């Protein structure tokens, strides 16, 4: 139920708490490569996403599915 992904951060919205990630195929849930919105709960996850947005560096992340909400459980940026 914890799903892992990778991609590039393309957008962040602090009102909706949404990180837009252009992610790779995720075979565990049968999703193709897409640009999709993930919800963050913690300022740390947002600050990692914001540094990824600046650099364009690849990001690894995990989330769970609640319908239209993909809830971020972790995020790592890679220099
Ligand atoms: Zn912290």
Author numbering: 14 to 92
What wording appears in the published article?
The periplasmic chaperone SilF has been identified as part of an Ag(I) detoxification system in Gram-negative bacteria. Biophysical and biochemical analysis of proteins comprising the sil gene cluster has been limited to date, with sequence homology used to infer function and the proposed resistance mechanism, after comparison with the more extensively studied cus and cue systems. Such analysis is consistent with the model that the SilF is a periplasmic metal-binding chaperone capable of binding both Ag(I) and Cu(I) ions and shuttling them to the SilCBA complex to aid metal ion detoxification. The protein has a β-barrel topology composed of five β-stands arranged in the β1-β2-β3-β5-β4-β1, similar to that observed for Cu(I) chaperone CusF. The X-ray crystal structures show that the metal ion–binding site is formed from strictly conserved residues His63, Trp71, Met74, and Met76 located at one end of the β-barrel.
Next, we determined the structure of SilF38-120 using X-ray protein crystallography. Unlike CusF, SilF38-120 has an additional 15 amino acid α-helix positioned between strands β3-β5. In CusF, this is an extended loop with no discernable helical or sheet secondary structural elements. RMSDs derived from the Cα atoms are 0.99 Å for Ag(I)/Apo and 1.09 Å for Cu(I)/Apo. Larger deviations are observed primarily in the metal-binding site, the top of the α-helix, and the final loop that leads into the C terminus. Recalculating RMSDs with these two regions missing reduces the value to 0.68 Å for Ag(I)/Apo and 0.98 Å for Cu(I)/Apo, showing that changes in flexibility is confined to the binding site and these regions. Although we do not see appreciable changes in helix formation from the crystal structures, most likely due to crystal packing forces, both of the solution experimental observations are well supported by the simulations where changes in helicity are clearly over long simulation times between the apo and holo SilF. Together, these show that the capping helix is unstable in the apo-protein and indeed could be unfolded to a degree in solution, as observed for CusF, with metal binding stabilizing the helix by an as-yet undefined allosteric mechanism.
